[PDB]
Protein backbone atom coordinates (compact mmCIF):
# COMPACT_ATOMS: atom_id res chain seq x y z
CA UNK A 1 0.00 0.00 0.00
CA UNK A 2 2.91 2.34 0.65
CA UNK A 3 3.63 1.58 -3.03
CA UNK A 4 0.45 3.16 -4.34
CA UNK A 5 0.79 6.52 -2.57
CA UNK A 6 4.31 6.75 -4.03
CA UNK A 7 3.02 6.17 -7.56
CA UNK A 8 0.10 8.50 -6.89
CA UNK A 9 2.65 11.17 -5.83
CA UNK A 10 5.07 10.58 -8.73
CA UNK A 11 2.30 10.86 -11.32
CA UNK A 12 0.53 13.80 -9.61
CA UNK A 13 3.77 15.68 -10.41
CA UNK A 14 4.41 14.38 -13.95
CA UNK A 15 1.05 15.82 -14.95
CA UNK A 16 1.79 19.56 -14.37
CA UNK A 17 -5.69 11.14 -21.46
CA UNK A 18 -5.37 12.67 -18.00
CA UNK A 19 -9.09 12.70 -17.21
CA UNK A 20 -8.78 8.91 -17.43
CA UNK A 21 -6.00 8.89 -14.76
CA UNK A 22 -8.05 10.73 -12.11
CA UNK A 23 -11.01 8.30 -12.47
CA UNK A 24 -8.77 5.20 -12.28
CA UNK A 25 -7.06 6.31 -9.03
CA UNK A 26 -10.30 7.85 -7.69
CA UNK A 27 -11.72 4.32 -8.07
CA UNK A 28 -8.56 2.42 -7.05
CA UNK A 29 -8.85 4.41 -3.79
CA UNK A 30 -12.14 2.69 -2.91
CA UNK A 31 4.73 16.25 8.09
CA UNK A 32 6.52 12.94 8.64
CA UNK A 33 3.97 11.26 6.36
CA UNK A 34 5.30 12.92 3.21
CA UNK A 35 8.92 13.01 4.42
CA UNK A 36 9.12 9.22 4.02
CA UNK A 37 8.51 9.39 0.25
CA UNK A 38 10.76 12.38 -0.54
CA UNK A 39 13.68 10.51 -2.13
CA UNK A 40 11.64 7.91 -4.02
CA UNK A 41 9.17 10.39 -5.54
CA UNK A 42 11.84 12.75 -6.89
CA UNK A 43 14.64 10.33 -7.81
CA UNK A 44 16.70 11.67 -10.77
CA UNK A 45 13.75 14.03 -11.37
CA UNK A 46 14.94 17.27 -12.93
CA UNK A 47 14.18 20.17 -10.57
CA UNK A 48 12.59 17.71 -8.16
CA UNK A 49 13.10 19.76 -5.02
CA UNK A 50 11.18 22.79 -6.32
CA UNK A 51 8.39 20.47 -7.51
CA UNK A 52 8.19 18.74 -4.13
CA UNK A 53 8.07 22.26 -2.67
CA UNK A 54 5.01 23.28 -4.71
CA UNK A 55 3.40 20.04 -3.62
CA UNK A 56 3.95 20.71 0.08
CA UNK A 57 2.83 24.32 -0.35
CA UNK A 58 -0.61 23.13 -1.51
CA UNK A 59 -0.72 20.47 1.21
CA UNK A 60 -0.13 23.38 3.60
CA UNK A 61 -3.06 25.53 2.45
CA UNK A 62 -5.68 22.77 2.49
CA UNK A 63 -5.05 22.68 6.27
CA UNK A 64 -6.76 11.71 1.22
CA UNK A 65 -5.80 15.37 1.14
CA UNK A 66 -3.54 14.61 -1.83
CA UNK A 67 -6.74 13.92 -3.79
CA UNK A 68 -8.03 17.49 -3.44
CA UNK A 69 -4.83 18.85 -5.01
CA UNK A 70 -5.65 16.63 -8.01
CA UNK A 71 -9.02 18.38 -8.35
CA UNK A 72 -7.14 21.67 -7.92
CA UNK A 73 -4.61 20.40 -10.49
CA UNK A 74 -7.56 19.81 -12.85
CA UNK A 75 -8.83 23.37 -12.28
CA UNK A 76 -6.61 24.26 -15.25
Amino acid at each position, epitope marked *: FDFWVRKLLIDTIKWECFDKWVKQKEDEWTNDLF*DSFFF*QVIYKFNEG*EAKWNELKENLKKQIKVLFNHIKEIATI
Partner: antibody, heavy 129, light 106 residues
Framework: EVQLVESGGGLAQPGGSLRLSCAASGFTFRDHGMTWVRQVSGKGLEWLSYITAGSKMSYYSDSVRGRFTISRDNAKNSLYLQMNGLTDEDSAIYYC??????????????????????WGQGTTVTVSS | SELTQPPSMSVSPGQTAMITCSMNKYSYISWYQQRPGQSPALVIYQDTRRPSGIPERFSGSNSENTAILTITGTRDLDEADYFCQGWDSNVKAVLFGGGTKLTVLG
Protein backbone atom coordinates in the same frame (compact mmCIF):
# COMPACT_ATOMS: atom_id res chain seq x y z
CA GLU B 1 24.44 7.68 21.95
CA VAL B 2 25.19 7.91 18.22
CA GLN B 3 28.95 7.87 17.60
CA LEU B 4 31.07 8.41 14.49
CA VAL B 5 34.75 7.76 15.14
CA GLU B 6 37.29 8.48 12.42
CA SER B 7 40.76 7.04 12.05
CA GLY B 8 43.48 6.64 9.47
CA GLY B 9 44.43 10.30 9.42
CA GLY B 10 48.01 11.44 9.53
CA LEU B 11 50.84 12.35 7.17
CA ALA B 12 51.11 11.66 3.45
CA GLN B 13 53.36 12.74 0.62
CA PRO B 14 52.40 14.92 -2.36
CA GLY B 15 51.03 12.53 -4.95
CA GLY B 16 50.80 9.83 -2.28
CA SER B 17 47.71 8.13 -0.89
CA LEU B 18 45.71 7.59 2.30
CA ARG B 19 42.63 5.68 3.42
CA LEU B 20 40.35 6.88 6.20
CA SER B 21 37.87 4.72 8.05
CA CYS B 22 34.85 5.48 10.20
CA ALA B 23 33.41 3.21 12.88
CA ALA B 24 29.71 3.93 13.36
CA SER B 25 27.65 3.02 16.42
CA GLY B 26 24.36 4.12 17.98
CA PHE B 27 21.98 3.62 15.06
CA THR B 28 21.12 1.38 12.12
CA PHE B 29 24.13 1.85 9.85
CA ARG B 30 22.36 0.18 6.90
CA ASP B 31 19.21 2.33 7.06
CA HIS B 32 21.00 5.62 6.33
CA GLY B 33 23.26 7.35 3.83
CA MET B 34 26.81 8.46 4.65
CA THR B 35 29.19 11.22 3.58
CA TRP B 36 32.59 12.86 4.09
CA VAL B 37 33.11 16.61 4.60
CA ARG B 38 36.44 18.34 5.07
CA GLN B 39 37.53 21.66 6.52
CA VAL B 40 40.84 23.46 6.21
CA SER B 41 41.65 25.15 9.53
CA GLY B 42 40.05 28.57 9.69
CA LYS B 43 38.10 28.12 6.44
CA GLY B 44 34.74 26.88 5.12
CA LEU B 45 33.15 23.45 4.75
CA GLU B 46 33.78 21.44 1.56
CA TRP B 47 31.66 18.41 0.73
CA LEU B 48 33.55 15.48 -0.82
CA SER B 49 31.38 12.40 -1.36
CA TYR B 50 28.26 10.50 -0.37
CA ILE B 51 27.40 6.79 -0.67
CA THR B 52 23.89 5.33 -0.69
CA ALA B 53 22.92 2.82 1.96
CA GLY B 54 23.26 -0.18 -0.35
CA SER B 55 26.43 1.26 -1.90
CA LYS B 56 24.77 1.37 -5.35
CA MET B 57 25.10 5.15 -5.77
CA SER B 58 27.96 7.54 -5.16
CA TYR B 59 28.18 11.31 -5.56
CA TYR B 60 31.41 13.32 -5.61
CA SER B 61 32.59 16.91 -5.79
CA ASP B 62 34.49 17.83 -8.98
CA SER B 63 37.45 18.60 -6.65
CA VAL B 64 37.90 14.92 -5.70
CA ARG B 65 36.53 13.20 -8.86
CA GLY B 66 38.69 10.31 -10.09
CA ARG B 67 41.06 10.70 -7.14
CA PHE B 68 38.83 9.81 -4.23
CA THR B 69 36.60 6.77 -3.89
CA ILE B 70 34.00 6.29 -1.20
CA SER B 71 32.89 2.87 0.04
CA ARG B 72 31.23 1.19 3.00
CA ASP B 73 30.91 -2.20 4.68
CA ASN B 74 27.66 -2.71 6.51
CA ALA B 75 28.84 -5.81 8.38
CA LYS B 76 31.35 -3.79 10.44
CA ASN B 77 29.43 -0.46 10.70
CA SER B 78 32.15 1.09 8.58
CA LEU B 79 32.68 3.86 6.02
CA TYR B 80 35.80 4.36 3.95
CA LEU B 81 37.42 7.06 1.88
CA GLN B 82 40.33 6.13 -0.35
CA MET B 83 42.31 9.20 -1.37
CA ASN B 84 44.97 9.19 -4.05
CA GLY B 85 46.94 11.97 -5.66
CA LEU B 86 47.10 13.98 -2.44
CA THR B 87 48.06 17.65 -2.75
CA ASP B 88 48.63 20.28 -0.05
CA GLU B 89 45.10 21.63 -0.78
CA ASP B 90 43.98 18.28 0.66
CA SER B 91 45.37 18.92 4.15
CA ALA B 92 42.40 19.47 6.42
CA ILE B 93 40.15 17.99 9.08
CA TYR B 94 38.01 15.25 7.51
CA TYR B 95 34.57 14.61 9.01
CA CYS B 96 32.50 11.45 8.81
CA UNK B 97 28.84 12.52 8.65
CA UNK B 98 25.48 10.74 8.85
CA UNK B 99 23.00 11.63 6.13
CA UNK B 100 19.70 12.79 7.52
CA UNK B 101 16.45 11.04 6.71
CA UNK B 102 16.04 7.50 5.33
CA UNK B 103 17.28 5.59 2.28
CA UNK B 104 14.83 3.41 0.31
CA UNK B 105 16.19 1.62 -2.77
CA UNK B 106 19.43 3.62 -2.91
CA UNK B 107 17.56 6.86 -3.66
CA UNK B 108 18.92 9.09 -0.86
CA UNK B 109 21.31 12.01 -1.47
CA UNK B 110 22.60 14.77 0.86
CA UNK B 111 19.64 17.10 0.44
CA UNK B 112 18.86 20.30 2.28
CA UNK B 113 15.51 18.56 2.92
CA UNK B 114 17.01 16.48 5.75
CA UNK B 115 20.55 17.85 5.89
CA UNK B 116 23.48 16.08 7.56
CA UNK B 117 22.38 15.39 11.08
CA UNK B 118 25.33 13.87 12.97
CA TRP B 119 29.00 14.87 12.53
CA GLY B 120 32.06 13.21 13.99
CA GLN B 121 34.94 14.85 15.82
CA GLY B 122 36.96 14.43 12.62
CA THR B 123 40.53 13.41 11.84
CA THR B 124 43.42 15.53 10.67
CA VAL B 125 45.17 14.75 7.37
CA THR B 126 48.43 16.48 6.47
CA VAL B 127 50.03 16.27 3.02
CA SER B 128 53.70 17.20 3.16
CA SER B 129 57.17 16.40 1.88
CA SER C 1 25.41 27.58 -8.76
CA GLU C 2 26.61 29.20 -5.51
CA LEU C 3 25.16 29.82 -2.03
CA THR C 4 26.17 33.41 -1.09
CA GLN C 5 26.50 34.42 2.60
CA PRO C 6 27.93 37.51 4.33
CA PRO C 7 31.34 36.67 5.87
CA SER C 8 30.62 38.41 9.15
CA MET C 9 27.70 39.88 11.04
CA SER C 10 27.31 41.59 14.43
CA VAL C 11 24.31 41.80 16.74
CA SER C 12 23.59 43.26 20.18
CA PRO C 13 22.45 40.85 22.92
CA GLY C 14 18.75 40.11 22.80
CA GLN C 15 18.54 41.71 19.34
CA THR C 16 17.37 39.66 16.33
CA ALA C 17 20.03 38.29 13.97
CA MET C 18 19.15 37.46 10.35
CA ILE C 19 21.81 35.63 8.29
CA THR C 20 20.95 35.52 4.58
CA CYS C 21 21.89 32.95 1.93
CA SER C 22 21.09 33.81 -1.69
CA MET C 23 21.02 31.29 -4.54
CA ASN C 24 20.36 31.08 -8.27
CA LYS C 25 17.83 28.23 -8.47
CA TYR C 26 15.72 26.87 -5.62
CA SER C 27 17.12 24.25 -3.28
CA TYR C 28 16.00 23.14 0.14
CA ILE C 29 18.39 24.56 2.71
CA SER C 30 19.86 23.22 5.94
CA TRP C 31 21.79 25.39 8.42
CA TYR C 32 24.75 24.31 10.57
CA GLN C 33 26.35 26.07 13.53
CA GLN C 34 30.06 25.61 14.37
CA ARG C 35 31.18 26.79 17.84
CA PRO C 36 34.94 27.29 18.45
CA GLY C 37 36.91 24.00 18.29
CA GLN C 38 33.96 21.77 17.49
CA SER C 39 32.21 19.88 14.72
CA PRO C 40 29.29 21.51 12.91
CA ALA C 41 25.85 20.81 14.38
CA LEU C 42 22.61 20.76 12.40
CA VAL C 43 20.36 23.61 13.48
CA ILE C 44 17.69 24.00 10.75
CA TYR C 45 16.66 21.57 8.00
CA GLN C 46 13.94 21.46 5.34
CA ASP C 47 14.14 25.24 5.04
CA THR C 48 12.16 25.83 8.23
CA ARG C 49 12.38 22.93 10.69
CA ARG C 50 14.59 22.47 13.70
CA PRO C 51 15.78 19.14 15.13
CA SER C 52 14.83 18.25 18.68
CA GLY C 53 17.18 20.05 21.06
CA ILE C 54 17.55 23.30 19.10
CA PRO C 55 16.08 26.27 21.05
CA GLU C 56 12.97 27.91 19.63
CA ARG C 57 14.91 31.16 19.02
CA PHE C 58 16.40 29.54 15.90
CA SER C 59 14.02 29.70 12.92
CA GLY C 60 14.37 29.58 9.15
CA SER C 61 12.72 30.56 5.89
CA ASN C 62 13.28 30.39 2.15
CA SER C 63 11.60 32.55 -0.51
CA GLU C 64 12.42 34.37 -3.73
CA ASN C 65 15.84 32.69 -3.91
CA THR C 66 16.99 33.81 -0.45
CA ALA C 67 17.03 31.75 2.74
CA ILE C 68 17.20 33.34 6.19
CA LEU C 69 18.45 31.94 9.45
CA THR C 70 16.79 34.05 12.14
CA ILE C 71 17.93 34.05 15.76
CA THR C 72 15.68 36.05 18.07
CA GLY C 73 17.02 37.02 21.46
CA THR C 74 20.63 36.38 20.55
CA ARG C 75 22.77 35.34 23.53
CA ASP C 76 26.50 34.94 24.10
CA LEU C 77 26.44 31.23 23.24
CA ASP C 78 25.03 31.99 19.79
CA GLU C 79 28.46 33.29 18.82
CA ALA C 80 29.53 30.83 16.11
CA ASP C 81 30.02 30.24 12.41
CA TYR C 82 26.84 29.43 10.50
CA PHE C 83 26.71 27.65 7.13
CA CYS C 84 23.86 27.23 4.72
CA GLN C 85 23.69 24.06 2.63
CA GLY C 86 21.86 23.07 -0.54
CA TRP C 87 21.98 20.80 -3.57
CA ASP C 88 22.74 21.22 -7.27
CA SER C 89 20.59 18.74 -9.23
CA ASN C 90 22.30 19.42 -12.57
CA VAL C 91 25.82 18.44 -11.43
CA LYS C 92 24.69 16.30 -8.45
CA ALA C 93 26.75 18.03 -5.72
CA VAL C 94 26.32 19.59 -2.28
CA LEU C 95 26.43 23.37 -2.03
CA PHE C 96 27.82 25.04 1.10
CA GLY C 97 27.85 28.75 1.79
CA GLY C 98 31.11 30.44 2.75
CA GLY C 99 30.03 30.80 6.33
CA THR C 100 29.10 33.74 8.55
CA LYS C 101 30.99 34.62 11.71
CA LEU C 102 28.28 35.90 14.04
CA THR C 103 29.63 38.29 16.66
CA VAL C 104 27.60 39.34 19.72
CA LEU C 105 28.51 42.84 20.92
CA GLY C 106 29.14 44.15 24.42
Amino acid sequence: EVQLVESGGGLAQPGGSLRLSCAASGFTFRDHGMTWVRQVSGKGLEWLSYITAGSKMSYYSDSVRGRFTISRDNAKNSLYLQMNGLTDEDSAIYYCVKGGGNCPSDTCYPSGYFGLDVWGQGTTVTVSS
Amino acid sequence: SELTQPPSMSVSPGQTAMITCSMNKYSYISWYQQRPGQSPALVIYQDTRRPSGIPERFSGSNSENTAILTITGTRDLDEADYFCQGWDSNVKAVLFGGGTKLTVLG
